[PDB]
Design a binder for this molecule. Structure first.
Ligand SMILES: [Mg+2]
Ligand SMILES: [Mg+2]
Ligand SMILES: [Mg+2]
Ligand SMILES: [Mg+2]
Ligand SMILES: [Mg+2]
Ligand SMILES: [Mg+2]
Ligand SMILES: [Mg+2]
Ligand SMILES: [Mg+2]
Ligand SMILES: [Mg+2]
Ligand SMILES: [Mg+2]
Ligand SMILES: [Mg+2]
Ligand SMILES: [Mg+2]
Ligand SMILES: [Mg+2]
Ligand SMILES: [Mg+2]
Ligand SMILES: [Mg+2]
Ligand SMILES: [Mg+2]
Ligand SMILES: [Mg+2]
Ligand SMILES: [Mg+2]
Ligand SMILES: [Mg+2]
Ligand SMILES: [Mg+2]
Ligand SMILES: [Mg+2]
Ligand SMILES: [Mg+2]
Ligand SMILES: [Mg+2]
Ligand SMILES: [Mg+2]
Ligand SMILES: [Mg+2]
Ligand SMILES: [Mg+2]
Ligand SMILES: [Mg+2]
Ligand SMILES: [Mg+2]
Ligand SMILES: [Mg+2]
Ligand SMILES: [Mg+2]
Ligand SMILES: [Mg+2]
Ligand SMILES: [Mg+2]
Ligand SMILES: [Mg+2]
Ligand SMILES: [Mg+2]
Ligand SMILES: [Mg+2]
Ligand SMILES: [Mg+2]
Ligand SMILES: [Mg+2]
Lengths: 155, 71, 115
RNA sequence: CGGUGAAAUGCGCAGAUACCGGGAGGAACGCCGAUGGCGAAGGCAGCCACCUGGUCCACCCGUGACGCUGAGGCGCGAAAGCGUGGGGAGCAAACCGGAUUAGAUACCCGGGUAGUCCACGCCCUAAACGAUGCGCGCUAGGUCUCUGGGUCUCCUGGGGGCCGAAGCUAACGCGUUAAGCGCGCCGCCUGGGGAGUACGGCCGCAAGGCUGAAACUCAAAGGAAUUGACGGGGGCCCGCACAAGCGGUGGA
């Protein structure tokens, strides 16, 4: 983006709950344009969630994002010697986006044999405060105030 | 034009190296002799003042240097 | 051992390192701290964070000697001179005054090649 | 603690750094301070008093051409450097040690002797530059500034700058602070390299200085300006160029 600021894509609302966040997540699950399979892996994972907790999966979902959303991170700057690892606060969107990505990426790590489950579980675990979804949030946030000695080379 | 010390004063003797109450006003928060910009003084005046303050400091009446108090 | 009501916090910041000693109202030092004492090695001592540390520990050791209030004297241009202050300011010591007393020669010793 | 891009050498539990008080010592004078002033130049800034040079303005009082220039001579002459004596804080050639680097044998860091400081005597060179000899007359103005005088809106002298008439210039530029228009007098130049070398002479305690070639060799050496290209120069802008992503190649 060198001339203009790039204008965020407006997503279509979800076909079951209406929350655009649902869809954003879905897309991140799918691969190779296989949107149907994705939705199925999402919505079936809701069923397991609606099953093993009783409450509403939409909200366990909308909760498991706050608990992976990193309040700030480290970016990179090079000054006059080499590259001091600089801290810097993370925007509205970049948080939401980092979250969905991380949820999926580490959901896919879990030992569970089937996809829908793997999503369901990570989407549950993290919704509480455990599981390598948060531990990769509690990681990027760790280095945020572990290199705060270099927090004056800001932009 | 923050405030010119030529105006806030009547007439005085620039060669008077004892008139602390006057001289005092041509120094900064530090002992530093104000710039002609803030003194409003003539070209000739400032050189005269300059010597008078030096004379008076040496006499013990005006300070060589101060210390800046964060006010 | 002693009990010191009010006192002085001297802050001497280099480009290389920031030292903070705390003294009695007669100026005799009680406890001090620096960036290296915090436990930093080289380049890292001269840092607005290292300095925020040096100050905090300085007042930590201090309020254990009963310290309550302090007048502050900073000598020097340098990083986190300002941080050292604010660190003191919001440390739990009431900050009576701040002054700068950085020694400016009235034109004396020829300085080293790199000035 | 210090120190650098990072770091070590160094210093520190014989208590350093940081802090307060006492003392000694040397060297340089912050602010005023200017894009300012003075000087023939080199150069000259804390303050005071003494001794002393140049210089500007007013008055238009005295002399009555007494003027200008100036081979040689004589004196001044930054810094480094020489001799004797004193001094030595900080700094710092050489030298010692740490790093860097392909190698440093330099640039960076920690030390450190001469020296830098005073007196006396030498040295006498410089990008000693305005790279512009001195003196005088003449040739629009504008503006800023230091400094005199007036019937001090403004007028009138002497400096210092910027911009410009005429003119000058190869151009850049100069332009009443001339590089313009003229007169006087001095110094100097006559292709590049060889070469500020050789020889000789003079000065010098020395280091060395002043004066100064040719043989030879080249066909250029040069000045300013133009277009371009390039810059580990600056400014603004663009490309999936980097970044932010998604998916791969490199492995089988
Ligand atoms: Mg733009
Ligand atoms: Mg002392
Ligand atoms: Mg001594
Ligand atoms: Mg002159
Ligand atoms: Mg000069
Ligand atoms: Mg007459
Ligand atoms: Mg006669
Ligand atoms: Mg007569
Ligand atoms: Mg004469
Ligand atoms: Mg003559
Ligand atoms: Mg000499
Ligand atoms: Mg000398
Ligand atoms: Mg000598
Ligand atoms: Mg000697
Ligand atoms: Mg070496
Ligand atoms: Mg050295
Ligand atoms: Mg040294
Ligand atoms: Mg006249
Ligand atoms: Mg005038
Ligand atoms: Mg003039
Ligand atoms: Mg001109
Ligand atoms: Mg013309
Ligand atoms: Mg003339
Ligand atoms: Mg000519
Ligand atoms: Mg010839
Ligand atoms: Mg020839
Ligand atoms: Mg010669
Ligand atoms: Mg020579
Ligand atoms: Mg010569
Ligand atoms: Mg000879
Ligand atoms: Mg001899
Ligand atoms: Mg000569
Ligand atoms: Mg040329
Ligand atoms: Mg460029
Ligand atoms: Mg990329
Ligand atoms: Mg890849
Ligand atoms: Mg292959």
């Amino acid at each position: 983006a060198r001339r203009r600021r790039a204008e965020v894509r407006q997503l279509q609302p979800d076909l079951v709950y209406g929350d655009v966040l649902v869809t954003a997540f879905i897309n991140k699950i799918m691969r190779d344009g296989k949107k149907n399979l994705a939705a199925r892996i999402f919505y079936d994972a809701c069923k397991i969630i609606q099953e093993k907790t009783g409450q509403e999966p939409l909200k366990v979902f909308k909760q498991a994002v706050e608990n992976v959303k990193p309040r700030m991170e480290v970016r990179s700057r090079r000054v006059g010697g080499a590259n001091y690892q600089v801290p810097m606060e993370v925007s509205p969107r970049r948080q939401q986006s980092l979250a969905l990505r991380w949820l999926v990426q580490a959901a896919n790590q879990r030992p569970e044999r089937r996809a829908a489950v793997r999503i369901a579980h990570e989407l549950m675990d993290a919704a509480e405060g455990k599981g390598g979804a948060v531990k990769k949030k509690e990681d990027v946030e760790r280095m945020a105030e572990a290199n705060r000695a270099y927090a004056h080379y800001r932009w | 034009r923050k405030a010119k010390v030529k105006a806030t004063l009547g007439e005085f003797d620039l060669r008077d190296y004892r008139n602390v109450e006057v001289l005092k006003r041509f120094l900064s928060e530090t002992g530093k002799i104000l710039p002609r910009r803030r003194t409003g003084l003539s070209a000739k005046e400032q050189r005269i003042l300059a010597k008078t303050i030096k004379r008076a400091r040496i006499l013990g009446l005006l300070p060589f240097t101060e210390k800046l108090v964060r006010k | 051992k002693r009990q010191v009501a009010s006192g002085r916090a001297y802050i001497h910041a280099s480009y290389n390192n920031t030292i903070v000693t705390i003294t009695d109202p007669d100026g005799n030092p009680i406890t001090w701290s620096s960036g290296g004492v915090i436990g930093y090695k080289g380049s890292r001592k001269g840092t607005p964070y290292a300095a925020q540390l040096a100050a905090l520990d300085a007042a930590k050791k201090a309020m254990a000697y009963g310290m309550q209030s302090v007048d502050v004297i900073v000598r020097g241009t340098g990083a986190g001179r300002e941080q050292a202050i604010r660190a003191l300011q919001a440390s739990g010591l009431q900050v009576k005054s701040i002054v700068d007393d950085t020694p400016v020669p009235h034109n004396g010793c020829r300085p080293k090649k790199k000035f």
